[PDB]
């Protein structure tokens, strides 16, 4: 159980060392990794594939590429709706703002 | 009977087989693929022709104008999601008026 | 000299569906461009799908998957119905 | 339910990645609905690819080919 001892040592190291909303915009714009929790998204795409299926398997890198592409499409639609939101003199976005960009793209 | 009419269809099979034979799409070709192309394109043609006849009946005419083609394609949902990004010469956009510009209704 | 078109077949299937309707030549050229465009779409997608399936031939399976790809699902199941009808009425080679 | 697995602070962090100051409470359900719609629209092609191939593994090659077919192509997982 040397891997378990190394994991407990790394967890202890993270617990000891590693452990006005304007900061989060510039904070999460320089982040590179994913931002959606992994295994609920895997359960969700398993439920989506149950509509169009048979015990269809799943490689892990395929679900990783799906999570990356879905996060990219969502931040693309959100970055495009922010401009239409501020264009209508709304700092706070609304569901009407994510209707025209969902309409005029297709 | 020839291969263009052995299946009791309308579109020619030798035409699309000659187009794929010199179009360099594969090494070989299965026998069911040109008649399958025949069936798919004749069903698409028959569906858009039925919608074109319905569009010509909607405007009480007999012949087909590009307005009848626009009423055939852009009114149906699947033809909109299939032929949305294609422009049509002298077609005509759909008649739709927003309500806030009308001061009554 | 000639240019390959399908105006005769379009007029034949149109008079077969409803003989009391006509069609001009501009809409005929539009529909000829349309059928050449969707033939190009299905043929290039089938070539892509055959190159992706490690198989350098074109059977009806790749065409079935390709019309399940780009056509909508109601038109996809109607297309596989028409395709199975075409193969079953063509296989009687007597 | 698995559609609500992407919770409220997840979409909040996504919006902070996309640069929003204040967000409303009507955003999250439409975000989840358009996410389910995009996932269905890519997964139908990605499983017809693996159903043609006499396979049951939805391979990364199949999802990058389905992404290249629908415009939004990814890099690194084939192609």
């Amino acid at each position: 159980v040397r891997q378990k001892r190394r994991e407990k040592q790394r967890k202890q190291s993270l617990k000891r060392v590693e452990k006005l909303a304007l900061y989060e915009i510039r904070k999460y714009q320089r982040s590179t990794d994913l931002l959606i929790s992994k295994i609920p998204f895997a359960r969700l795409v398993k439920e989506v594939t149950d509509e169009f299926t048979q015990d269809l398997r799943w490689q892990s890198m395929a679900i990783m590429a799906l999570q990356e592409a879905s996060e990219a499409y969502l931040v693309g639609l959100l970055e495009h709706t922010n401009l239409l939101a501020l264009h209508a003199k709304r700092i706070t976005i609304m569901k009407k703002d994510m209707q025209l960009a969902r309409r005029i793209r297709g | 009977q020839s291969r263009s009419a052995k299946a009791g269809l309308t579109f020619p099979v030798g035409r699309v087989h000659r187009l794929l034979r010199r179009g360099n799409y594969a090494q070989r070709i299965g026998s069911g693929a040109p008649v399958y192309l025949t069936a798919v394109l004749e069903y698409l043609a028959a569906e858009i022709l039925e919608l074109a006849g319905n569009a010509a009946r909607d405007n009480k005419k007999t012949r087909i104008i590009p307005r009848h083609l626009q009423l055939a394609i852009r009114n149906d949902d699947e033809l909109n999601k299939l032929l949305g990004n294609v422009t049509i010469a002298q077609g005509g956009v759909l008649p739709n008026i927003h309500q806030n510009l009308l001061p009554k209704k | 000299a000639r240019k390959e078109t399908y105006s005769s077949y379009i007029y034949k299937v149109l008079k077969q569906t409803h003989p009391d309707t006509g069609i001009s030549q501009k809409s005929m050229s539009i529909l000829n461009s349309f059928v050449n465009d969707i033939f190009e779409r299905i043929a290039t997608e089938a070539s892509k799908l055959a190159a992706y399936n490690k198989k350098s031939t074109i059977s009806a399976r790749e065409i079935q998957t390709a019309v399940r790809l780009i056509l909508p699902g109601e038109l996809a199941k109607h297309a596989v119905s028409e395709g199975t009808r075409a193969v079953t009425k063509y296989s009687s080679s007597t | 339910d698995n559609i609500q697995g992407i919770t409220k602070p997840a979409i909040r962090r996504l919006a902070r990645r996309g640069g929003v100051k204040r967000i409303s409470g009507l955003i999250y359900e439409e975000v989840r609905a358009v996410l389910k719609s995009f996932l269905e629209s890519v997964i139908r092609d990605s499983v017809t690819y693996t159903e043609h191939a006499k396979r049951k593994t939805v391979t990364s090659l199949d999802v990058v080919y389905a992404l290249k077919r629908q415009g939004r192509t990814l890099y690194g997982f084939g192609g």
Partner: peptide, 22 residues
């Protein structure tokens, strides 16, 4: 010869709801 009709009930009004399932 004769072609049967299908479901033509909508222009697929989307972007605030979901689509139909076959």
């Amino acid at each position: 010869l004769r072609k049967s009709t299908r479901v033509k009930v909508a222009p697929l009004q989307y972007w605030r709801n979901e689509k139909i399932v076959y």
